[PDB]
Design a binder for this molecule. Structure first.
Ligand SMILES: CC(C)c1cccc2c(-c3ccc(CS(C)(=O)=O)c(Cl)c3)c(C(=O)O)[nH]c12
Ligand code: NA
Ligand code: NA
Ligand SMILES: [Zn+2]
Ligand SMILES: [Zn+2]
Length: 233
């Protein structure tokens, strides 16, 4: 169909790529957790004749399948990866990446939280992101720390050349009726953190959630709404 792939269309262990813009793809994979199956997204951004990866494909095998799918569909090497928070849908697979020669990065807060959780730990620390509103350049993207939301460490990623906003798990898809896995969230601060994203990236044309379908800027307000519905009741 060429439509964005959904959870029941991707067997656990396979990876799909979806072209978002020139030189920008999302990656989609599925994984089992506590007896249910979930989809999750990451990002791939062309960096000259190299690629920057945002987030693993949620597990070692899935991430190996991601590298194979990239080689098949794109044919450029992944040289660096950034994980946008400490959960396994973001760092599970970092050991696969590192063994494949990919330099792996995350904020110090993410690295500490991953270590404490028993999750895989990116090698290199990203400084300059410890205060809400901070932004740094990393290859062809900007990394932004909006404040605590889905997790205290969540980062968002903007691709200026394409006006693509990758919200990660701080941003939910439009069809969502709940706020996802809130175990490590700050539901009170989340709406303020979304407001920071909205103020910083008013020209975003595509917004990609951590799980589910991309859309436009409406995903940001929708996320604030579903988080309030959860917090309220
Ligand atoms: C801790 C990690 C590894 C993890 C494990 C298992 C599930 C999740 C979810 C998640 C995402 C979407 C929905 C559907 S929804 C918006 O509620 O309609 C649901 Cl149920 C759960 C998330 C997330 O929210 O980022 N993380 C998960
Ligand atoms: Na986790
Ligand atoms: Na959480
Ligand atoms: Zn998470
Ligand atoms: Zn998530």
């Amino acid at each position: 169909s060429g439509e964005y792939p959904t959870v029941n269309e991707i067997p656990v262990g396979e990876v799909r790529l979806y072209q978002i813009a020139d030189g920008v793809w999302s990656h989609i994979a599925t994984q089992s957790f506590d007896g249910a199956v979930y989809p999750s997204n990451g990002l791939i951004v062309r960096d000259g004749d190299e690629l920057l990866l945002i987030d693993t494909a949620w597990g070692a095998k899935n991430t190996a399948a991601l590298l194979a799918e990239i080689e098949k569909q794109i044919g450029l090497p992944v040289t660096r990866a950034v994980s946008t928070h400490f959960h396994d849908d973001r760092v599970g697979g970092v050991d696969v990446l590192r063994a494949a020669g990919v330099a792996t990065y995350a904020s110090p807060s993410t690295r500490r939280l991953a270590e404490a959780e028993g999750n895989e730990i990116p090698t290199h620390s990203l400084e300059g992101l410890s205060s809400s509103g901070d932004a740094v350049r990393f290859g062809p993207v900007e990394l932004f720390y909006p404040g605590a939301a889905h997790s205290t460490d969540n980062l968002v990623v903007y691709v200026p050349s394409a006006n693509v906003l990758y919200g990660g798990c701080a941003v939910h898809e439009l069809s969502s009726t709940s706020a996802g896995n809130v175990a490590d969230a700050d539901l009170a601060e989340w709406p303020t953190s979304v407001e920071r994203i909205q103020k910083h990236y008013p020209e975003a044309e595509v917004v990609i959630p951590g799980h589910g379908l991309p859309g436009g800027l409406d995903l940001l307000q929708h996320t604030a709404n579903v988080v309030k519905a959860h917090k309220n009741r």
